[PDB]
């Protein structure tokens, strides 16, 4: 966008509809276009470091629950030639900084997580404080602008450009009830509670993938083994409860994921804590191959998934094994037995099924 060279983390080619920004990126910034901008400048939700990049010389802060957009949009501040060291990167759980004179809001996926970071940001904006979300016009629901008009005060709404759409937002400070970072419901058939930040995956309750999954883990387990796409833990909490000798690796793209799982370990077991790794990452990125026992994996619901049995069976030991719980219709047990050589049925729901491969 505007003579910025950008990229999709994995990298798209020219057809792909996904690309690095979309028009409400450059709504977004066109909105400043006649401004004197006044930092702190924070950026939310920026996917890929498109708004990041166009504002670097601001010295921006990119917030959001995204190790992934981290480091794509590094990757972008290299193709441009700009610094790093020109954009902060924080959590979306973290402090923001105070007196931001800009906020820029790409709306995100849940309404959860925009809550929470509107909680947030009206710990620190003011009514000097210029902000303004963006985001597909199909996504700015009545829902949002509610959302708005609760936590930070009255909003405008802008005609449509482009299939982009966006909010202004003049912070009001309304009365409003304090809420819990996290959500907690009991995990039937345990002691535990698990307790789920703002983007989690299946964070009102117990994912049935998961349940299906639980019931044909493997046992009695050395080594480490991964929780690969950790979300809330409990398949990675499940595995500590039943392979009392392996060390767990909870790992996952999303910050606010890994910080629910060390939470419902701390919660559930902390005697288990000695054994456990808390990993931001993309998938097994960097990480030593010939590492691992077992992988478990139970995958969003693509190009990811293979990376992630790409990466499960470089970071396995020899004889080391993955296993998977999928949708039953996608094609999962032909590209493990490509990529691995073999492939096994555990187990088969109306819905799900449970595949094991072992490296060899
Ligand atoms: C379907 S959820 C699985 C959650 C939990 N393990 C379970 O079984 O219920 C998939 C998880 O993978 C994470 N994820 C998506 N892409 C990833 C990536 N490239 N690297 C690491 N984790 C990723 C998502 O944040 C999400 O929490």
Known sequence: MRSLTL?????????????????????????????????????????????????AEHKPYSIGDSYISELATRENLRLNGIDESSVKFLDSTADYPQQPGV?????????????????????????????????????????????????????????????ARLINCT?????????????????????????????????????????????HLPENLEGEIVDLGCGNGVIGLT????????????????????????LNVETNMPEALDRCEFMINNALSGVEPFRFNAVLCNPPFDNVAWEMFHHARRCLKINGELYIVANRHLDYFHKL????GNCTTIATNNKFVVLKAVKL
């Open 239 to 262: 595995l500590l409860d039943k392979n009392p000798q392996a060390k767990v690796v909870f790992v996952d793209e999303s910050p606010m994921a890994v910080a629910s799982s060390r």
């Open 337 to 340: 037995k490509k990529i691995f």
């Open 7 to 55: 990229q999709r983390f994995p990298a798209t080619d020219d057809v792909n509809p996904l690309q690095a920004w979309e028009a409400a990126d450059e709504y977004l910034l066109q909105q400043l276009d006649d401004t004197e901008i006044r930092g702190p400048v924070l950026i939310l939700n920026d996917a890929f470091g498109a708004l990041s990049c166009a504002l």
């Open 103 to 163: 906020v820029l809001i790409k709306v995100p996926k849940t309404l959860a997580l925009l809550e929470q970071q509107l909680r947030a940001l009206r710990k620190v904006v003011t009514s000097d404080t210029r902000i303004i979300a963006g985001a597909k016009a199909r996504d700015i629901h009545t829902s949002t602008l509610e959302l708005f008009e609760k936590v930070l005060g009255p909003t405008t709404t802008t005609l449509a450009w482009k299939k």
């Open 171 to 215: 912070f009001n400070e309304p009365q409003l009830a304090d809420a819990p970072q996290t959500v907690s419901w009991k995990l039937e058939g345990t002691d535990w509670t698990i307790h789920n930040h703002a983007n989690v995956f299946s964070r009102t309750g117990l994912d049935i993938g998961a349940r299906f999954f639980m019931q």
